[PDB]
Each structure stands twice: as C-alpha cells, then as structure tokens.
Design a protein around this ligand. Structure first.
Ligand SMILES: [Ca+2]
Ligand SMILES: [Cl-]
Ligand SMILES: [Cl-]
Ligand SMILES: [Cl-]
Ligand SMILES: [Cl-]
Ligand SMILES: [Fe+2]
Ligand SMILES: [Fe+2]
Ligand SMILES: [Fe+2]
Ligand SMILES: [Fe+2]
Lengths: 359, 359, 355, 354
C-alpha cells in the first residue's frame, strides 16, 4: 500500500500530452495526421509533435521513433513552476526514481520532471510550455472528424484500489467505478479538470497503457471517423464501437494505430468539478455499464494494451492481476451479465451479449 | 421462373403501410407510441393506427390484435384508382389469389386489393386513403428520436433471383445486391420511389417478413433511440447496430418489438430515381457490405423473421432455402470474410469479425 | 395564357445541372471547389465541370468563362432518349425557339435539346450522360460542409400564375405557394422528383435566375459552411441564413459566388411524390413563411438575381412585374407582417421583424 | 476603484442558480417547463424550482412570484462551508450590505450569504445544497431541445474595467474581451470553472441582468428550440440568433421569457482552465466578434435588460454608462464595422450588416 507523503502534492491541472514510441514514423504520421487530422506543431526525422484543434500548448501527442512501441511518458501540466519542485519532493518521498530536466525532455516543454511512479508508470510533470496558434476558430482547417481536445489516459494496473488511493493522495477524485457484490474493484475513473477523468485505472496485468482519449465536438464527428476508416478500407483497425458509455455517459469509439496503441475518441461527458460530485458505482455484471446499448465488449479490449517504458527507455516488467478478471466474470464461459438486475430475460451466461461467444 | 404477364403492371408509388398482428395490444402500443413516438391516427380495443411525423395518409402502421403474431399485409400505394384494377388483373394473370374490398380492409383506406403474391407474401394495393394532419412542422411534438417516414419493407424468400425478376416486371428496379463468385444471390434491394428501396429480398427460409424500416432526419435521432432504450433498461431489444450500411450507405439500427417483429431505423441513403441508376453489387465475403465499419452481423439477424399470413389469416407455410446461406459462408464454420480483397490481413476464417464467434 | 400542347409532355426526372457563365474562372473555381468542396469531373482553360458527393451523372454544375455572368442553361434529365424527341415537339408546338445537338452542348451530355421557354428561360432536356464514379461512400474525401446532391432551381418571373400553369402542363406539381387575400400570387414551388421542388417561381422582374440549390446530409454541414466563411473572412458573402424555411420546412442558407450568383444550401424537406400531395398555401404577410423563426428577409434577397441568356448567348431582356411586390407588402414603408394571425402583438408595420 | 480586501476571497466553484422574480407564475412555468423542458425540483403556488438535465444540486433556476419582474439573486457555489464565512468577511470589508441565513433563502439551499455587491448586483454564495437525482442518463426524459447545464450569467454595468478588476480580485480570470484602439472596454467574459465564463460584463446602464445562459449538448438542440418556438407561434420571442459567437466560439440563441428576461442557449465553447489561458481581445468594430457569420446584432440586445433587486426586494437604481456605447459605435448613425480590417468592401457605415 502506498503511503501519503508529508510533502504536498503538486497541483495538477489536467492531462496534457503523451509521448508514444512508434516503430515506423511515416506510417504513424499517416494515421495521426492523414487519417485523424491532428495538427503538426513540429516534426523531423525522429519525432512528430501533434496537437488537437483547440489546444494552445505546444502539443498533445509526441510520436518518437524507436525500436519497441510503447508509452514513454504520460504528462500532466501543473498549475505553477513551483509545482514541478513539489512533484519532485513528493515522488522522492515515495522512494520513486525521478529525473529532472530544466530544459525539458521533448521540444516545446520547459522545466520538467519525469518519474517512474509507484505503479510502474512514466509520468511527467511540467508547467512551462511553448504556446502555439490556438486553432479553435480555424474552420478552414476543420475536418468532419476533427479531434478538438486531449481528454484522458487510461492505465492498466493489477490492483485498482492500491492505484486509486495513490491517485487520491495526488488530488484526483474518483467519479465512477465498477465493482462487484463481493468487494472486487475492476475499474475506476478519476479527475482533476472537472470532466469524468484525466486518468483512469483498468484492472489487469500491468503497467500497461490502455488508451489515450481525444474529444470531438459532436457525435457525428465520431461516426465520420468510422466512415472514413471504411472508405480507406482499414475498418479492421476499428476495435470497438461506436457506442454510448455507461460509465461517463460519453459517446465513444476505440481504434488502433499502426503499432496497436489504442486511441479512444470521446464526446459529451458531464461536469464533475464540484467537490461533493456524486460518485457512481456500476455492478460488473451490468451489461449497460461499458456500452449503454448492451453491445458486447470485444475481448481484445480487455486483454491488449501498450507496453510502458522506464526512464532508461526499457520496457517495464508486467505484474499479473490476481483479483477477478472483468472479461472472465462477464463474457467468458463462466461469466454472466444482465440487462435488468435480477431478470433472466436479457441475461447472458457463458457468452457475450447479442448472440456472440468469444472468438 | 415467374412469367411476365401481358396485363400491364399497376403503377406503384411507394410502400405505404404494414398491418402487423400483435398478441398484446397494450404492450405493442407501449413500444410503438411510448418508446418510439409514432403518432396515433385512431385506436380502439382491437387495433392501433399509427403514422410517422411527415405522413399525410391515414397511417403507416396498423397493429391488429390476434392470436399469432405475423405480417398480415404490406401495402403499397398506387398512382390512380384505376391502378387497383390493374393490380387485380395482373395478379390474376399470375394465378394468384386476390381479394377486393371497395371500402378497404382497415380504417382510413378505401378501395383495396389484397393478394397472395407468387412468393407467398400478402401485398395490398390501394389508392384511396383518408388524409390527416401532416405533422411535419409540429415541432411542439417532435421527439429526440422522431420517426419521420416509412421507408421500406424487407422480405425473406428462399430464391432471390426468382423474386427479383418478378419485382422487376412489377416495375421495381434493383439498386444494390449481394452475390458471390459462384452465381449465388444472397440479397437484393429494389425501389419505386427513388430511394434505395421500397422492398428488398433477403435470402432465407420464407415467406417471412424480415423488417419494416422507418427514417429519421439525422443520425443523432437514431443514437437517441438507443440511448432511450438504455434508459428504459430494454437494451436487450436492440438487436443490431447502430451502424453504417455498405449496402444503401444509410445509418441504421435494428430493434425488436414485443412480438419480435423487427424494426429498422434508417437515415441518409441516396437518390435512385434515374432509370439507369448504377446497380451496386457487393461480394458476400466483403466484411464492409452490411456494416461498413466491419462490425459483425449477429446470427439472429440472419435466422429470425416474422411469420406472414395468407388471405384467410392463417400462417403461410415456410419453404426452406436450398441456395448457400449468407450466415454460413461469412461467419459459419467454413465461413470467410475480408476487409481488403486479396489481403489475408484483416480477413476472418470460420468466425465473425472483431473477435467474436457464433454463440 | 400559355396554351397546353396537343403534343405529349416529355417525362422529366429531375433537375440535373446548371451551366453558369462566370467572368473569372479561377476565382469561381476557388469558391466552388476550395470553399464549397464540389468535385471536379473535368476542367480546362474555359470550363470547370463539377458534381456533388452523391452524383453519378457527369456533372451538376458547369462553369463557363464568358464576358457576362449569367445562367446559360438549366438542365433537366428525362426518362428515355425518346423523351428528348417529345420535348422538341412539345416546345415547337408552343412556338418556342429550340436547338438540338446529338452530341451535347457541354462535355458529358449526349443528345440534348435547348429551348428559350415561354418565360424567357434557357431550358435543356437530355437523357444521355457519361457516368462517373459515384463518390457517395468516399468518406476519405468528405468535407465537414459537404454538398451531397443538386436539389433545385428557383426562377424569377413577373407573372407567377402564368408560369405555374405552363409548368403544370409540363408535369410539375405545385407543393407550396405564397398568396394574399387579394388574389395575388408571390411564389410557387413545384416538383417532379418527389421533393418540395425541382424548380420554383419567385415573383419579380424577369427572366432572372434566383438561385441554384444544393443539399447536405445534416444541418451541422450548413453551419460549417458559415463557420468556414467566417474563418476565411468572407462572411460578407453570406446573404441570408442560416434558417428554417416555412415553405419546404428545410434548413437553409444563401450565399453569393464571385459573380453574385446565389447558391442555396438546403437539407431535410419532405416527400411530395404522391399525386394528391397536399398543397400548402401561406399568406404573404405571415412572418414565419420564409424564415420559420421570424428572422427578417434582407431586401437584396428580393431584388437581386442573375441574368439569363438566350440560345445565342445574349442576355434576355427583363420584363417588369406589375403585380404587388413581396418586398413592398411585407417590409417596405407600407409593409406588414404578423407572427400570429389577427394578433397585433408580434406584428411589424413599415419595417422588417426583429428590430 | 473597488479596493482589494485583505480578507481572503471565497473559493468560488461556478455559477449555480438564479432566482428570477416573475409576475405570472403559470405563464412562466409554461415557458421554462413546457417550452424549454427544464425539470421540476419543487413547486408550490409561489415558486417553481427548476434544474437542467445533468445537474445534481437542487436547482439552477428559481422562479418567484412577485409584483415586479427582476433578478433577485445570482448564486455561486463555493468550495467549502467556510467559504461562506470568507464571503461574508470579504464583502463586509468592501462595505457592502450583507445578509446571512444559516438555513438558506430558497428551498434546497442551506447556509447562504446574499450581498448587494459593489456594482449593485444581488450575489449569493452557498456551499450546502440538497442533492437530487442527476438526470444525465434519463434519455426517457430527454427533449429534442434539452438544456443540459447552467453555463453563465451576463451583467450590464456602466464601467467594465472597474467591475473587471473587482471580479479578478474575487478569482475570476478574463478569457475574452472587446475593446477599441482608443482604450474603451465594451465587454469582458471571466471564469472560475474552466469554460469561457461564469459571469460576464456588458457595458451599459446598470446594474441590470443581461441574460442567464444554459447549455445544450449539440447545435441541433438549439435549432430545435427555434423550430419549436415557430410551431408554437412564439417566434417573436426569438430575439437574436441562432448564430456562432466570435467571442467564446459558442453556437448560440437568445430568447425572451414572459417577463422579458433574456435566456441564452449555448454550446461548444473551449477549455480555459490553465492559468495562462491566452486572453482574446476583439476590436469593437469587427463585425465577426459577436456573430462570427456577420449577422447584425439587433438594437434591443444592447438596450434591453432585466432590473435587479436589492436585499429588501426593491429595484436597484440604474447608473448611466458614460463610456462609449457599443451600439452607437457599430450600428448607430456614426457607427461602423468591418468584415476585414482596413477593407471598405464588407464594411458597414451608419447601419448594421446584411
Ligand atoms: Ca466463392
Ligand atoms: Cl468502456
Ligand atoms: Cl445489412
Ligand atoms: Cl424563403
Ligand atoms: Cl454576442
Ligand atoms: Fe477512456
Ligand atoms: Fe432494411
Ligand atoms: Fe430554394
Ligand atoms: Fe452569454
């Protein structure tokens, strides 16, 4: 269990960017720029720096060429320069490996701290960043599938309560979670910026990065991403969706980049900024908790996720989840889910909803 | 093969309404009025007459209480009173049983002809109908999920080419179809009114009624239907979707009424009214043909459909399809689909797409 | 009155394309292709052939460079090759000038008949056309403002009843109109393809072309055209809208091309294909008849319209409307409009709505 | 100037509700419930309490029957119970009239402070509120025009700089404003919750309440409100729009309730939560600043606004703006605007646009 430091937590504003390692920079560029329409802030033979339509900081995504595709850093902006020092003192008191660079780890970020956090995740904290042209009224550039904001990260970790307590001490507040009647926690969402989440924990073998999520303005923007992927004859890279989430109430889609990094496209969750924001707990067997329309969750969504790196750029070793598996207890041969609690009609036993079993 | 009559075909305008027999009238009313928001033109203890938002004829759907749920009639409006005479002559020459009622079979329809057509389907032809208030600008009534039009029927019949030729002689033109490279036709869509279809043929055991389709204005209206079904905790009645079709290019959803009658909600197909409108043929193994995004087609979609009645009100005997089954050749044990023709990557062998197998 | 021929009317399917004369081919290209996202079927130094996202015929719009900006032809497609024969006999019986070309007037159209119709408009009738790739599922090309179909034309003509009867004899059915309680007709809409219109008559000095209309799938696609025009700092080419029409019930926008040819963007009208489709009549003083939300109609919308050419490429002389003017009776100095019939509250006297 | 108190500012979360006095409660209920679809949290013969689709606090709007239509209180939720004490000490130091009710002024609110603020506006600060069913997934109730969140207030005040500095001291940050080259400020928008605003200042005679704004999910929801008003033959109560704002980038509509209280419907502004969020200044003569599509702003939008009440429930006397008028410099007889700066083509002189 992770103790609460005596040192004050840094004041975290929001998720700000991820740095993903990618194996073929040109094919990743085709996906993020040509298919998804993200905006280039800088690029060279080694890296592509990308931002969403409404962003003013330098980037939301950095694609770094390297030998092994993986999450290199998930970065949170903090409220003041001094909060970077606070983060350093906090993680040092946790006994975590830290690395400070006064001039940043990536272009367009200044003074920055990277840490191997207690769950094995590479986090960055920074304040200083190079401001760029905010493209939010550049409707001459606007795509039918325009990605407007970075919304959140989602992390796979074997012990959700242990992770949750740690993120609570860091100032994140839980908005929604998924549990069962026998006291197991399968997932939790938690926030700083007043949306449903900034980062989220998914119970599973880890550390691994489940996804990075971008917003659109409207639902039709997400439908267009699907339609465009069908036109490009890359519908096999649509993993799951589109749907309505139970948890978050957002309209969603999950797609896969060329190195199998999962991207969620997301819109229209709700305000969580009040400090007594009501938490919402879903039962793991509730077949409307993940897709509100009861569509089945593809098993890859539960099993696959990206490697993460340590601060030397080596892959973090995986620790196996010992708590019950969400896949197994819902859609596996011994699983079940319901539409109405207590009702056998519209319940599924040993298979997924809507007439499928696991492939 | 069904011979082309010497008598001229009636001039058919469009699909106009269906009469469905339902077992529990109040339950069916709850589905079509309270859930789906159709507008009541008349009701009593035995029948409910319903219309869409933009209709000016009396009704698009009649629900009739009876002991065995079934399609009782699928009704087409014809251009002139004299076309009802033409229909009668045409079907008599085809050797079909016909019944003519000067004052209609249902309220709000006048002179009408019902026939047992050569595929065993109960068709009605009429011109005369009581006009009602067209609600197309009654935005004080407009629901977030509003059904604006009746769009089409879809019929299950064992021999698609045989039915297709008959419908072409009756003046329907095929807009799209699904075939393989071995001479088999699995489905065809055909129209009079200048949309992708007024009726359609789906290969399988029949006669059965696959579905009735209603349109919305926008994609978000279909999303709202799903969202409402979730809120009402009847997401188990969402069979398939929502999705983008390959065939038709429409956004779509399939739901199931209380007697398992299938209803499609549909929007934004394209204009077919030119007489040389290009006919689109999709290969049965193309995994974007039914769902453009590659989502799997649930097996119930292929296997389940509604009984149809003869003119005496008895269920028509089902004739088994002997041609290859779309289910079997795509998602069955010896099935195959592709995302990209000739590419093994994104292809599926003996299972469905997106990680699923047949339950 | 224009007499009804003995000769059978051609079977007309739909409005199919317009040929517009433009003065600067590059500026017009920039409008129609870069701003509006229409798709190029063919172009050379003299002409650009454009189509909408869902079209399979060769084009919906031909831009032709010339000295005087004008409508050169409004073309309708007919059901069969023999319908072009029918059209020719029909207009000859009306004593109209016709010209027939077995290989088309423009690329991608085969046997075609052009006429100076009894209202002074250049109609084309054709069947044969070169099929192209239908781009209806090319979502890799789809724009946030995508124009998906050609929907209709709208014509300015001084005597609407006279024009109406002629179009009815040709097989068009009136769907909606605007009249007053004094026997005047101000506008009418009429159709072949089963939407609210294929062509429409606006009462005014004419012959002039009021607009050409293109459809989008959704209302947000029209919003995006406005948003883009703001970003391009060309919001002054937004004439009117966006709005909901009373007449047609469609969501709409009117914008102006570089030669002031007016383009409507339109979506979500209703099905008119039944032969007893109920005709809807609006009173001219009903302030919800043109914009359902009661937004005022700018005077330029009533006064400005494009010249049309005769078959020699010369401008048609404009004949003055003597019937009452829609502008004058609604928003002129002695104009009137109401929100609720018989209610003084929400009525406007001698001025337009909303202040 | 309004001096900065030494006492700490209350930590304000967001705009939370407005209490509007209405003269005919049944007519007002018809507008807010039957036309606009707000959800009833409580009602009796004297008041109706209403909330938006995604709200969990007791209400976002209280309609109170009374003799004179006016804003009675604009209420902000604060972060903790002790922030109500800080608010009291803060306004007391400012020299303002205050009133504290430990059991609230309206149902469903607990310990609350109302103040006559330095600009003459009745502000309320509270933490405690009765939680209700959050209806955010009640799609069985969802209307085609659904109002999903209370978004902000907009105040008319004569001296925008004076009010801006006061609100900045209270922790609001300016996100956008409208100025001219001669140094006049005509309006400013400022936030606590990380949208473009929680309250906004419009230059004019005041104190008056310009509008209260509610959000929808999508732009079609706003279109529907207009369409419904047409069907109900009350299109005369659509004042301005629908449009795209320059300021805020939001899609918008303005409508008038039965007492002429102005309601904005609003969607899809942008994130402002970072402390160095770039502030955007528009020139008053830019015809895309208010409606991005260059549609003209009707004069009523500039000249009409709601009375506000003092703590005794009497109407606050109005102080006339002495700075230049946005109406006069853009659409009045000596006014002008441009589409492109420096370009006479697309410019308007002594008239509005279009
Ligand atoms: Ca084969
Ligand atoms: Cl999920
Ligand atoms: Cl399908
Ligand atoms: Cl109009
Ligand atoms: Cl504004
Ligand atoms: Fe997520
Ligand atoms: Fe269908
Ligand atoms: Fe038009
Ligand atoms: Fe506002």
């Amino acid at each position: 269990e992770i103790p609460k430091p005596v040192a004050p937590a840094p004041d975290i504003l929001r998720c700000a960017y991820a740095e993903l390692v990618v194996t073929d920079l040109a094919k990743s560029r085709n996906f993020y720029v040509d298919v998804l329409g993200l905006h280039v802030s800088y690029e060279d033979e080694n890296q592509i720096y990308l931002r969403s339509f409404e962003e003013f900081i330098h980037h939301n995504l950095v694609l770094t060429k390297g030998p092994v595709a993986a999450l290199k850093a998930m970065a949170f902006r903090v409220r003041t320069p001094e909060d970077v020092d606070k983060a350093e003192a906090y993680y040092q008191e946790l006994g975590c490996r830290t690395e400070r660079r006064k001039d940043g780890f990536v272009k367009g970020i200044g003074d920055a701290l990277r840490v191997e956090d207690p769950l094995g995740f590479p986090y960055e904290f920074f304040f200083e960043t190079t401001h760029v042209e905010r493209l939010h009224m550049r409707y001459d550039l606007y795509s039918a599938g325009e990605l407007v904001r970075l919304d959140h990260f989602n992390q796979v970790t074997p012990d959700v309560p242990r992770g949750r307590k740690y993120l609570e001490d860091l100032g994140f507040r839980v908005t929604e979670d998924i549990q069962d009647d026998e006291g197991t926690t399968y997932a939790a969402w938690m926030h700083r910026k007043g949306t449903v989440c900034d980062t989220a924990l998914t119970g599973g073998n880890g550390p691994r990065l489940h996804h990075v999520a971008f917003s659109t303005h409207e639902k039709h923007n997400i439908i267009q991403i699907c339609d465009k992927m069908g036109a490009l004859r890359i519908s096999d890279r649509i993993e799951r969706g589109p749907g309505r989430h139970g948890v978050s109430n957002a309209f969603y889609l999950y797609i896969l980049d060329p190195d199998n990094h999962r991207i969620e496209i997301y819109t229209q969750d709700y305000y969580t900024g009040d400090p007594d924001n009501p938490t919402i707990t879903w039962n793991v067997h509730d077949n409307q908790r993940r897709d509100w329309w009861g569509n089945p969750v593809v098993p890859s969504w539960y099993t696959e996720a990206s490697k993460v790196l340590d601060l030397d750029g080596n892959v973090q070793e995986i620790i196996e989840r010992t708590d019950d598996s969400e896949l197994e207890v819902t859609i596996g041969a011994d699983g079940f889910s319901f539409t109405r609690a207590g009702d056998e009609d519209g319940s599924y036993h040993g298979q997924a909803s809507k007439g499928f079993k696991l492939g």
